[model samples]
Target: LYEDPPDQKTSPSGKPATLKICSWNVDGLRAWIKKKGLDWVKEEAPDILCLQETKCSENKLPAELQELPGLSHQYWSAPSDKEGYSGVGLLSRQAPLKVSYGIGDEEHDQEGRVIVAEFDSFVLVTAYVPNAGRGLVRLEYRQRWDEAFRKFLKGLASRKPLVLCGDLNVAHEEIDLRNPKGNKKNAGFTPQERQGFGELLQAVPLADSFRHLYPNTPYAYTFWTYMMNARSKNVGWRLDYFLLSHSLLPALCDSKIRSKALGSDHCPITLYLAL
Candidate 1:
């Protein structure tokens, strides 16, 4: 078992520094951390790295990651019900003053899919939204979760500005996928699922960070299947996102989908905040 070291930093700005936040569904944290070089962190040095589907418990992470430079503080939430499934974690250079785990409901909370870290500027909440199963068997549950999650966000936003990031599991518009018409009835692109996402935006003043930054650009996707040359063909879905509160919108500088990085079917999505 590896342990994260204490956070240590000196701010040259003499004020709060800008934070670059990145979210990635690593597929399996332990495996990917070992396979992929820590050069990404050394190069990008995001202030906060939110990982989904970590597929490992806090006790199982490797030493290299625990000792990774620039990520001195870490918080992990892993599924209590199952091993190696549906876990999420947060790594940060600045230690959060307060942290919250779970989404308020016991059922979803048990899956360890959400975590919130509070800083002086904003509250960063990360999640790995549960997928609507094959044939849409879990569609209803997904809808329920959406409502619950939205309410949770509203509650948080009421207290402080929010930066919500993760794989939300739904492609919001036609431009979000390559073949939207063909996948209209598909799980991630289904009208019901997409409408749920729309409702989420309507309920809050939150805006999609990437779309807000680059409205004209298209063909940006974060998830692609490993089978049938999906990544090469760019037949993918933009499921991962960083949604920011209205007050925080001006601070949003840039958003990106790191398609070249490997280790998971979903690539990393980054948001740069001016702070």
Candidate 2:
């Protein structure tokens, strides 16, 4: 990790040498827009925006979204075998050198779960990790999926610095959720799934950007259930995250949970990096 001295922190262009990248699992893009979610993007104006659970085909994107100012470069991925499920989208002011879908595995690719955008200095990836369904029906497959993802991230990190953001679907530590003990048997709080996240971090040496900056912060969550007014009550889990290559630690300005700006069950997260 490199640090810029105070005088060198601004770019030659006189602007702050930082890029704001935001990730939000819109839950459903079309519905989000109808609820004026686009207003949040326009106001926040992140340099790059990653959306998960779009749950709509590219062709179905509303015109307002297609014309969002400043984020003209758009890439989308959708499940090949399913409709209205497991989709992700990326929007950026500057286009990437290359963009690829999935983890390069046909089985995992079937669900449109990943999008990798290779930039000049760092690689940006957004993913909607598979959820272990209720009753843990898909837990086994979810473990395999995490292993596959770990391998994929390792391959990328070997070449360039990387930033990954999305609904990872697990609360890595008990502090990440409000009621950890009671939810241990559930999908996201399960020890098995938490271990998978730990292994993934070790494999690539990635830093959980938010926790890295605010290790002692609590009740800071990104996703809340609709049942029983969870969001209002602040009963939630920190399921979404921004994971970055350790080399980028010095450049991290802030990793924020925009918990108040919401149209879906999940809120938006922003990362400021000097890259």
Name the best candidate (by lDDT): 2
Lowest summed-lDDT stretch of 10 residues in model 1?
1-10
All models: lDDT?
0.83, 0.88
lDDT of 1 by residue, 1-102 (tens): 111122212122333337788899988886676657355656668989999998878888778776788898999998887788989999999999899998
Measured against the true structure, the TM-scores of the candidates, in listed sequence, are 0.91, 0.94
The residue ranges of model 1 lying beyond 4 angstroms of the native Cα positions read: 1-17
- Native-structure RMSD, model 1: 6.5
Best by TM-score: 2
Model 2, 1-275: lDDT tens digits are: 11211223343344454798999999888889877788999999999999999997776776887688899999998889777888999999998999999998887888878999999999999999999989999999999999999999999999999999999999999889988998999989898899999998999989998898778778888889989998888889999999999988878777888887878999998888877
Clashes of each: 0, 0
